[PDB]
Amino acid sequence: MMMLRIRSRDGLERVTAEGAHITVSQLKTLIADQLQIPLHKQTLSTNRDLLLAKTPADLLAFTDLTDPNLPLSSLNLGHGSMLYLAYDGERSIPGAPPVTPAGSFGRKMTVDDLI
Amino acid sequence: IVMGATNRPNSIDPALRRFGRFDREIDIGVPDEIGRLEVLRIHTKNMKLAEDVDLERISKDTHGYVGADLAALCTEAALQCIREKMDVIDLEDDSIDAEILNSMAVTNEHFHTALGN
Amino acid sequence: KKDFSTAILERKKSPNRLVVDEAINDDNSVVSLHPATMEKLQLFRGDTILIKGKKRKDTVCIALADETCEEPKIRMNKVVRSNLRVRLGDVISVHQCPDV
């Protein structure tokens, strides 16, 4: 059991895996089965600039984690580690707490304001 | 049929008590002990309350109370019961525990405190 | 027993709310906690958290760690604390923001 953080353009998520003994292919399969992200869109990396790309070819250019054959143990991943996942399209990450809009304090109405 | 309503019949227009206009006058006075007991039994039918409730003692202790004041007393008892449980309920969480919501019941002590207040 | 006539005003202890005091780092979007707080909250390095303050005000800040920080304190700098409309010695809740 190991918890790995997944950073994307939409924000941050987390995934629980069996351990670092699996490879990138198993990690991608688990991501598909848990976050419901299709395999053809998932691209993994360790650099923070992966999410700064705007083309799937550019995402695949970061081959430090693109290849599914590479074992996860060789990357020294651990509890609370950081990974970057890029995928086509924009999604809304679940679990968002309610946030009040700016300036919405003191809605003091008046009779003149009503008029 | 015309049914008036007032508080002091002296303050009404003296010409309205002539024969034919308002010839029947009824005095809804302050209830006695049995009246207060019946009013309380009517008002506390919907509230949750423990078996310890002693409505006879509350009826005897209340003197000079009318129906409205007894309704206010029952409301005060319920509010006191909620306020005593307030020490464990957190206002920041709108998800009040279901068992907590069903573990609140008014007893005799809350009624006595509300009567005192 | 206790006097319950004023039983609403007082706060209730929770592992989700801490106390606000001064810090060292002076970046506009950083706040320094203690690693035990992250362990209790299941938070990790570089996570961006949501801070909720007085009069329904809230902001987003990056939480880092240091051993100097105490577990029941948050070590909030002056700028963020001014944005939260709070002062040292008050209670501030903490949550996590999934959507950056």
Break chain C down into helix, strand, coil percent, rounded to 5. 15, 25, 55
Assigned token pair, A64: 């430090």
Phi-psi region of A11 (alpha: psi -120 to 50; beta: other; left: phi over 0): left
Residue of A nearest to C51 (CA): A99
Residues 6+ apart with CB under 8 A from A111: none
Nearest-Cα residue of chain B relative to residue C3: B84
Give the dihedral sign, CA A77/C49/C81/C13.
negative
* Closest CB to A94 among C48, C55, C98: C98
Q: Please list every residue in chain C whose beta carbon sits closer than 8 Å to the beta carbon of residue B95.
A: none
* Nearest CB to C98 within list A11, A80, A104: A11
* Contact state of C56 with A104 under an 8 Å Cβ cutoff: yes
As a whole number of angstroms, the distance between CA B27 and CA B56 comes to: 26
Closest CA to C73 of C28, C20, C29: C20
**How distant is the Cα of B70 from the closest Cα of chain C, in angstroms?**
21
Q: Which chain C positions have a beta carbon within 8 Å of B90's beta carbon? A: 12, 14
- Could you list the beta-strand ranges (E) of A1-115: 2-7, 12-17, 43-45, 81-86
Structure tokens at A18: 């069996």
3-class DSSP string for B49-79: ECCCCCHHHHHHHCCCCCHHHHHHHHHHHHH
Whole-angstrom distance, CA of residue B43 vs CA of residue B109: 18
Q: Which residue bears the tokens 């968002």?
A: A96
For residue C79, give both structure tokens.
């700028």
Chain A neighbours (≥3 Cβ pairs under 8 A) are C
First to last CA, chain A: 64
- The answer to whether C57 contacts chain A (CB < 8 Å) is yes
Cβ burial B90-104 (10 Å sphere, 16+ → b, else e)? eeeeeeeeeeeeeee
Burial of A53 (0-12, 13-18, 19+ CB in 10 A): middle
- Provide the phi-psi class of C56: left if phi over 0, else alpha when psi is between -120 and 50, else beta: left
Look at the block and give the residue holding tokens 């996570």.
C47
Contact C19, C89 (CB under 8 A): yes
Give, in order, the Cα–Cα distances in Å from A13 to each of A78, C48, C51, C96: 16, 12, 19, 11
- What is the strand order of the sheet C17-19 is part of? C17-19, C91-96, C48-52, C58-65, C30-33
Report the distance separating Cα C95 and Cα C99, nearest Å: 12
Could you tell me the CA-to-CA distances from A19 to A27, A79, B59, C44, C83 in Å, in that order?
10, 10, 71, 18, 42
Q: Choose among B18, B77, B76, B84: nearest CA to B52.
A: B77
- Do A105 and C55 make contact, defined as CB atoms within 8 angstroms? yes
| Interface contact B83, partner C, CB < 8 A | yes
CB C65 within 8 A of CB A80: no
**Measured between alpha carbons, how far is C31 from C35 in angstroms, rounded to an integer?**
12
For residue B91, list chain C residues with Cβ-Cβ distance below 8 A.
8
How far is it, in rounded angstroms, from Cα A54 to Cα A57?
9
Q: If you ran DSSP here, which 8-state letter would residue B47 be given? A: S
* C-alpha distance across the termini of chain B, in Å: 42
Beta-strand relationship, A43-45 and A12-17 = unpaired
The reply to whether B63 sits in an annotated binding site is no
Strands C58-65, A43-45: pairing kind: unpaired
Chain C neighbours, 3+ Cβ pairs < 8 A: A, B
Tokens 């390095």 — which residue?
Answer: C45
